[PDB]
Design a protein around this ligand. Sequence first.
Ligand SMILES: Nc1ncnc2c1ncn2[C@@H]1O[C@H](COP(=O)(O)OP(=O)(O)OP(=O)(O)O)[C@@H](O)[C@H]1O
Ligand SMILES: [Mg+2]
Lengths: 35, 103, 76, 76, 97, 132, 48
Amino acid sequence: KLLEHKEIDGRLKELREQLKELTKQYEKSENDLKA
Amino acid sequence: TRLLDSEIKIMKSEVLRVTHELQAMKDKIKENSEKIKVNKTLPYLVSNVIELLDVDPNDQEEDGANIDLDSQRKGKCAVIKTSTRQTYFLPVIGLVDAEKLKP
Amino acid sequence: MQIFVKTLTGKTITLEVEPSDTIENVKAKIQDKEGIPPDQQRLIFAGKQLEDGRTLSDYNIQRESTLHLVLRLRGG
Amino acid sequence: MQIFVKTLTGKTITLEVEPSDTIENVKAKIQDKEGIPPDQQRLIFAGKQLEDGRTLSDYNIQRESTLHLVLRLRGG
Amino acid sequence: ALDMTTLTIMRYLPREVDPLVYNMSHEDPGNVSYSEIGGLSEQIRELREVIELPLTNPELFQRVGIIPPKGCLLYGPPGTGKTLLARAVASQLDCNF
Amino acid sequence: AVDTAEQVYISSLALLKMLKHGRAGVPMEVMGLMLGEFVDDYTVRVIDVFAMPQSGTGVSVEAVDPVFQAKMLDMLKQTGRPEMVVGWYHSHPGFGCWLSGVDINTQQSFEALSERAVAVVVDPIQSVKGKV
Amino acid sequence: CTKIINADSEDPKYIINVKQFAKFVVDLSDQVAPTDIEEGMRVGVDRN
Ligand SMILES: Nc1ncnc2c1ncn2[C@@H]1O[C@H](COP(=O)(O)OP(=O)(O)OP(=O)(O)O)[C@@H](O)[C@H]1O
Ligand SMILES: [Mg+2]
């Protein structure tokens, strides 16, 4: 039987959690540099 | 029937794309950060905040030749007085949040 | 009122919606559920695909009608 | 396999590539052929400006198709 | 505002608010009331008749045919409440002060 | 090797276009691109010019997006004028004429794509009734 | 010649005053120890 995705989805979810917050760190930094 | 294993092609193609992309952004926020560090340097004039002001764009704001500073910033703008007794307008404040500045 | 959704993974979901909600809005709500980007999403009603600018009510989707949700690779 | 690119000078360039090649790998090959900094060069095809992480495969590109290369431009 | 390399006009601006007058305009935590000032209940009315009424009901004086006074001074020995009166008026009259 | 005799030929139309565009952006340093042909290794002709859209920094400008020029460079060939691009220009109002420390950088890649490239500069407020 | 005002703590930055030019935020050189620089004393400062 096939259930493959679940565990890797959790991994992707942690990555999502990182990636989204990392974009915040990006945006503010660029909002400084552009000034 | 057991069907539509396409998820796996969905899955791994996501995993790689995300994993590298995050790392690349991690690098750039690193690099751009040191860029900021070099603007600060050390000698700084001291001055007093005279004002805190709030202005809105022109009625028409074409692209072409247009200045991304004298218009189209949503935040405040400021006026400062230097120790050398000059007055300058600042259409953007810089590295400090206006929410904690007072005349 | 709610629709039902059946995924290729066998997951069943029970989403409260307005029938006047656009399919693109429903896909945005699904992304809100699980981050799944709407471009990857495909919605089928009773073997009919749902147009992005379509509502639900346009074929009168109501009352726990089970849409099939299919995931596809996409890229311009 | 092999692919072409052209630019506003009338110059054409030909690269040995594979569909698995990333856009950043393409940019690297372009610099290896001509030395241009990868951030001043920009690529266009199908009316879409490229991004680094995707690949020739997911860009749906086919044999000997011709990309457009264009340059960053600022005063200062 | 002038561009500092060529001095060509860029924008017009409103007038200054000199920071001393800003700090003068709204700095008062005091909150006393006319219940906290005993024994000069008539001078209070004598002052209120000048600052409060012609600010809000101006046609009466026009009918009688006069213009109200502009100002008054409070005087007397130390410690008789001269600042307390002004604190109370400031706390309990809606205006700019 | 390069020489001391190379000569640049410009048409009237490029002149009027450049003057008008530079004078309109009077407080700031506008941008544009110019096209023509190398008829030989001693002489270069510029035939026509078209403006470009920017977002302006206070000091200077950067070309906002290349899709615009990617369109233009084929949009007009349906009406002749098949020439390729040869250079670019920007205007200094009243400063004089020189290349800044970043203009040089921009010229670097133009030359790296084609070694014959040129840069042009104009002064729209000091030029009077002649001697542009 | 300048007159120091105060010293920001730990890794140090200083405030400088001169009687017609402006005030500044500055630091030291390698040849002066951070001990003998108490606030309220005239010091020597480079010109650039
Ligand atoms: N009539 C009064 N009723 C109540 N408290 C009073 C009265 N007069 C003075 N005080 C008290 O005096 C104290 C402060 O005095 P106040 O600020 O009024 O000084 P002042 O009379 O204006 O003096 P000065 O002329 O030196 O300014 C307070 O504790 C206040 O309660
Ligand atoms: Mg008093």
